RNA sequence: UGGAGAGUUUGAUCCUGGCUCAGGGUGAACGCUGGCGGCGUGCCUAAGACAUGCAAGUCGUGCGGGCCGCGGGAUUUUACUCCGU
């Protein structure tokens, strides 16, 4: 069992002959706070089945978060559409200084000291997606070494 | 040792994009309120106009006087004159 926080719920709507037709979208993170997180986007006729559905997709979509005591190996910037995130390593004592969206994601990978900036489009969905791509993109001294040995 | 963002264009969406808020600051002023103290601080406007008092003197160990005193002398005649203070 991982942890699970709901970042976002929204109600969307389509049109049909006489009246609009509502739907709900749910952004949910799940994490063991020990270097494993997942993002999930779940949509349904009702909030619950949606949230719940998110949960399910979150766990099916997971990342190696190579913590190095509270923080991440190095800096990364990732663009996702018009959304951009910068992630920066911090010495212990700082905290997760981030916006609600990536805070949630960082916290549940058990990151505790990180400096972030949201740049470009601040649309939650894409910020969240960038954050994940960013983490998914972190290497460590080891991995680099492996890559370059040959 | 250092970096958080949110609201608002649509029936809904993504994006551009402006407006707006959350923080910090001030020689402040204004409203309601107002107990004590220490340390700071107080014409940002007319370099407009200014009553009155005070804000730059001191040296008699550089010099000679004037005015008000006091005291000594010369003459034994009282006026005149010398010295000290
Ligand atoms: Mg771009
Ligand atoms: Mg923008
Ligand atoms: Mg409006
Ligand atoms: Mg329009
Ligand atoms: Mg509307
Ligand atoms: Mg905007």
Curated annotation (Swiss-Prot):
Molecular-function GO terms, alphabetical: rRNA binding; structural constituent of ribosome
Domain S5 DRBM: 2-65
Keywords for this protein: Ribonucleoprotein, Ribosomal protein, RNA-binding, rRNA-binding
GO cellular component, one term: small ribosomal subunit
PROSITE patterns: RIBOSOMAL_S5, S5_DSRBD
InterPro entries per UniProt: Ribosomal_Su5_D2-typ_SF, Ribosomal_uS5, Ribosomal_uS5_bac-type, Ribosomal_uS5_C, Ribosomal_uS5_N, Ribosomal_uS5_N_CS, Ribsml_uS5_D2-typ_fold_subgr
UniProt GO BP: translation
Source superkingdom: Bacteria
Function according to Swiss-Prot or TrEMBL: With S4 and S12 plays an important role in translational accuracy.
PANTHER family: MITOCHONDRIAL RIBOSOMAL PROTEIN S5 (PTHR48277:SF1)
Assembly mode: Part of the 30S ribosomal subunit. Contacts proteins S4 and S8.
Assigned protein family: Belongs to the universal ribosomal protein uS5 family.
NCBIfam families in alphabetical order: rpsE_bact
Further facts: Is positioned such that it could physically interact with spectinomycin.
Comment field on protein domains: The N-terminal domain interacts with the head of the 30S subunit; the C-terminal domain interacts with the body and contacts protein S4. The interaction surface between S4 and S5 is involved in control of translational fidelity.
Protein name: Small ribosomal subunit protein uS5
